[PDB]
Amino acid sequence: SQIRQNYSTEVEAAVNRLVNLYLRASYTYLSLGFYFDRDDVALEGVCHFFRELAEEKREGAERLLKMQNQRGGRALFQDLQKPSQDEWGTTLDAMKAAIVLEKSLNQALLDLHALGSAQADPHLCDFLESHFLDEEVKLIKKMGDHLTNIQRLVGSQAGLGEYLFERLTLK
Amino acid sequence: SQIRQNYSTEVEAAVNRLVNLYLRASYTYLSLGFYFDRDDVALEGVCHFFRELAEEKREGAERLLKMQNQRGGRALFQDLQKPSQDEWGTTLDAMKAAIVLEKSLNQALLDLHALGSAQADPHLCDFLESHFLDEEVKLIKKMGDHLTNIQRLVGSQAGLGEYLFERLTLK
Amino acid sequence: SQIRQNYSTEVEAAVNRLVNLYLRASYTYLSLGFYFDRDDVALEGVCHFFRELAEEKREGAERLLKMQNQRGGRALFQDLQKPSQDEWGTTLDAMKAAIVLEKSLNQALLDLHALGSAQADPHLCDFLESHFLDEEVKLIKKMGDHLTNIQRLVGSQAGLGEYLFERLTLK
Amino acid sequence: SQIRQNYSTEVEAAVNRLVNLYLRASYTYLSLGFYFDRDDVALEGVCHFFRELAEEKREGAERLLKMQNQRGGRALFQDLQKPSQDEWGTTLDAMKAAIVLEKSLNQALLDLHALGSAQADPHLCDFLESHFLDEEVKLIKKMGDHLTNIQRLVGSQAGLGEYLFERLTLK
Numbered sequence: 001s002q003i004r005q006n007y008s009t010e011v012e013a014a015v016n017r018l019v020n021l022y023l024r025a026s027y028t029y030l031s032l033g034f035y036f037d038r039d040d041v042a043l044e045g046v047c048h049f050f051r052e053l054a055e056e057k058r059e060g061a062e063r064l065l066k067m068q069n070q071r072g073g074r075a076l077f078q079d080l081q082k083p084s085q086d087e088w089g090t091t092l093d094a095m096k097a098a099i100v101l102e103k104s105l106n107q108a109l110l111d112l113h114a115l116g117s118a119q120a121d122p123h124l125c126d127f128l129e130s131h132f133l134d135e136e137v138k139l140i141k142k143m144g145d146h147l148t149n150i151q152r153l154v155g156s157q158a159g160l161g162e163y164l165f166e167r168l169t170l171k
Numbered sequence: 172s173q174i175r176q177n178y179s180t181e182v183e184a185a186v187n188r189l190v191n192l193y194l195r196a197s198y199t200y201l202s203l204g205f206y207f208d209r210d211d212v213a214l215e216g217v218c219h220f221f222r223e224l225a226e227e228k229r230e231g232a233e234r235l236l237k238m239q240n241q242r243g244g245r246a247l248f249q250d251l252q253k254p255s256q257d258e259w260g261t262t263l264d265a266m267k268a269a270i271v272l273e274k275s276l277n278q279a280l281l282d283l284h285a286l287g288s289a290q291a292d293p294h295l296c297d298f299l300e301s302h303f304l305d306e307e308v309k310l311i312k313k314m315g316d317h318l319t320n321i322q323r324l325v326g327s328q329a330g331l332g333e334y335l336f337e338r339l340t341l342k
Numbered sequence: 343s344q345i346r347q348n349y350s351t352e353v354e355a356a357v358n359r360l361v362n363l364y365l366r367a368s369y370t371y372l373s374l375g376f377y378f379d380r381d382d383v384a385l386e387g388v389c390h391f392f393r394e395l396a397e398e399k400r401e402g403a404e405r406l407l408k409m410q411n412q413r414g415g416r417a418l419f420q421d422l423q424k425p426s427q428d429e430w431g432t433t434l435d436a437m438k439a440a441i442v443l444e445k446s447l448n449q450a451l452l453d454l455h456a457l458g459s460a461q462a463d464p465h466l467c468d469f470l471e472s473h474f475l476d477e478e479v480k481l482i483k484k485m486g487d488h489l490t491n492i493q494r495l496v497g498s499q500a501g502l503g504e505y506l507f508e509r510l511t512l513k
Numbered sequence: 514s515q516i517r518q519n520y521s522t523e524v525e526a527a528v529n530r531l532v533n534l535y536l537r538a539s540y541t542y543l544s545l546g547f548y549f550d551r552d553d554v555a556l557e558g559v560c561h562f563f564r565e566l567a568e569e570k571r572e573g574a575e576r577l578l579k580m581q582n583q584r585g586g587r588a589l590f591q592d593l594q595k596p597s598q599d600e601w602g603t604t605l606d607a608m609k610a611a612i613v614l615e616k617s618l619n620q621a622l623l624d625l626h627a628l629g630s631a632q633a634d635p636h637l638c639d640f641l642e643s644h645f646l647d648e649e650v651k652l653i654k655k656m657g658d659h660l661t662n663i664q665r666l667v668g669s670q671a672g673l674g675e676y677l678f679e680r681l682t683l684k
């Protein structure tokens with residue numbers, strides 16, 4: 001590549017893996033969204049929340065792919081593994097699973113920053129810092145908040161709690 | 172002081188103490204606010220309510236400091252003692268503590284008015300009347316109202332009550 | 343904490359100390375501001391300059407407290423030590439003291455970045471970089487500029503120099 | 514008087530004396546204003562400052578006269594004694610004399626409040642508090658500030674200091 005400069009094959013490879021993680025997160029959230037749109041679940045605000053996350057994660061992957069090209073790396077695509085579940089249980093189950101997922105994405109971002117740092121690739125480190133690390137931290141805080149409110153509510157009368165959360169907190 | 176007129180050293184000293192009480196109230200409310208912003212508490216409307224009070228109390232102190240200068244007194248600052256608690260429990264615990272705090276501020280205002288009256292300092296008395304006494308009374312009424320509503324709600328299912336209060340009453 | 347990830351107890355503790363430094367800086371600037379508002383000092387542009395800094399430092403502390411919560415740390419508040427002086431002398435004395443203060447805040451920021459770097463906490467490093475390091479550098483440059491102009495002016499006729507600076511440079 | 518209620522002849526009499534003090538202050542300020550408008554003094558910003566005060570004091574007297582009528586007292590007018598000087602010296606001399614004058618007006622207001630208090634006349638006390646006491650305190654603070662700045666400036670080169678004050682502080 002005529003443009004490639006200070007961009008290691010290790011970072012290129014990790015970037016392609018991170019794109020796959022993001023597309024997979026996006027796929028997971030798509031399945032979460034349409035689960036809550038079922039007539040027997042019917043929590044529209046939960047559906048909108050996860051469908052918005054499907055979009056965000058897809059955008060994350062595209063920004064990674066745009067960056068890969070800017071550096072002269074080569075995008076390599078792999079199979080996208082289907083989500084870990086077909087049914088997601090209650091809002092509480094679903095938000096717990098979403099937090100697990102975001103934490104693993106965040107861990108992958110931190111591992112990539114550490115690689116970039118080891119490879120002395122400051123553009124990589126800045127790119128993650130600017131576009132991904134802060135947004136992951138903000139998102140995980142939001143989910144933890146949600147989880148605290150769902151839990152507070154589904155003490156007595158789980159059904160009432162679940163309806164109230166979706167109506168009064170979710171968009 | 173070329174400007175000082177009818178302004179006793181007793182009133183000057185009490186004014187400096189009242190500034191310290193207000194800054195301390197402000198500090199207490201800052202700690203209340205960020206406690207309710209924790210991911211394991213997550214009552215954003217309670218956080219906004221106390222963060223607004225932190226600001227109000229800070230402004231109260233500045234108005235007192237501006238007045239002290241207008242009269243030719245000398246501002247003297249002391250250590251600000253940290254809030255009485257690190258964790259504030261439920262919304263109910265927190266609102267009870269806030270009411271205790273406001274009542275003690277109000278008592279300090281009343282003691283200063285009584286001093287001003289004893290010293291025949293009408294400008295002091297009017298300044299407190301105009302800017303502090305009415306606002307304290309209105310605020311304490313608001314808190315008592317809140318406390319009544321929290322209590323009414325946290326009879327059965329304390330968690331549901333706490334969520335509903337924060338969603339339907341707080342901003 | 344359900345959300346805490348890659349956030350060491352060392353960084354949490356240093357963050358709480360930095361909040362205390364900022365609140366203390368804010369307190370110092372409040373005292374600087376009202377000193378220059380005295381009828382026997384009466385340099386309104388110097389008062390506005392330090393009162394603006396009191397506000398900025400308070401905001402710095404709140405951003406740190408918001409961040410602490412975003413990461414799952416626990417805010418811990420301590421006593422705020424009163425400012426180092428009760429009277430601040432001339433504009434020159436005061437600006438020198440302000441520069442000392444800002445330099446020590448900047449040093450605390452640099453020590454926290456070095457800790458974050460040692461702990462491999464990129465979100466911390468980026469957060470300081472983005473919101474604090476640049477603003478401290480810009481502010482310290484501004485103060486040094488001011489100090490040079492005050493000094494140039496208070497060569498002959500210190501009183502005239504001090505009035506002219508406040509009228510023609512300060513807002 | 515069909516309307517007179519709780520309005521003692523002592524307060525009525527003191528009110529008429531206070532009107533005379535205000536009209537006399539107004540007259541003093543008129544003479545201060547036109548002195549600084551002389552071609553051999555020529556400090557237009559000082560002239561505007563005192564001419565504005567002549568107007569304020571005249572308004573103070575009219576508010577007192579309107580109040581006297583509202584209570585069923587009878588306005589009684591006396592001779593207005595000419596100002597204490599024909600020439601007012603420097604800006605510094607003039608501002609010192611203005612501060613003396615305002616302090617004596619303020620003292621007369623405080624004596625009238627004390628009378629009103631002794632006579633249990635709350636409407637009188639409130640009327641002074643609302644319209645006169647605060648404005649006197651604010652004005653005296655402003656004058657003291659001015660005096661500090663004039664003094665700071667007329668250390669070396671009294672003429673330069675006097676010109677700069679009038680240009681950069683006065684309207």
Ligand SMILES: [O-][O-]
Nearest residue numbers: 055056059060
């Ligand atoms: O669209 O971000």
Ligand SMILES: [O-][O-]
Nearest residue numbers: 052055056059
């Ligand atoms: O929505 O970004």
Ligand SMILES: [O-][O-]
Nearest residue numbers: 226227230231
């Ligand atoms: O702002 O009151």
Ligand SMILES: [O-][O-]
Nearest residue numbers: 223226227230
């Ligand atoms: O808000 O005052």
Ligand SMILES: [O-][O-]
Nearest residue numbers: 397398401402
């Ligand atoms: O407000 O920064």
Ligand SMILES: [O-][O-]
Nearest residue numbers: 394397398401
């Ligand atoms: O002002 O930031």
Ligand SMILES: [O-][O-]
Nearest residue numbers: 568569572573
């Ligand atoms: O016109 O006051």
Ligand SMILES: [O-][O-]
Nearest residue numbers: 565568569572
């Ligand atoms: O001008 O009142």
Ligand SMILES: [Cl-]
Nearest residue numbers: 004005006007
């Ligand atoms: Cl290379």
Ligand SMILES: [Cl-]
Nearest residue numbers: 175176177178
């Ligand atoms: Cl006195």
Ligand SMILES: [Cl-]
Nearest residue numbers: 346347348349
């Ligand atoms: Cl971890």
Ligand SMILES: [Cl-]
Nearest residue numbers: 517518519520
């Ligand atoms: Cl009667």
Ligand SMILES: [Fe+3]
Nearest residue numbers: 051052055056
């Ligand atoms: Fe969308």
Ligand SMILES: [Fe+3]
Nearest residue numbers: 052053055056
């Ligand atoms: Fe979006």
Ligand SMILES: [Fe+3]
Nearest residue numbers: 055056059060
């Ligand atoms: Fe987006």
Ligand SMILES: [Fe+3]
Nearest residue numbers: 052055056059
């Ligand atoms: Fe979008």
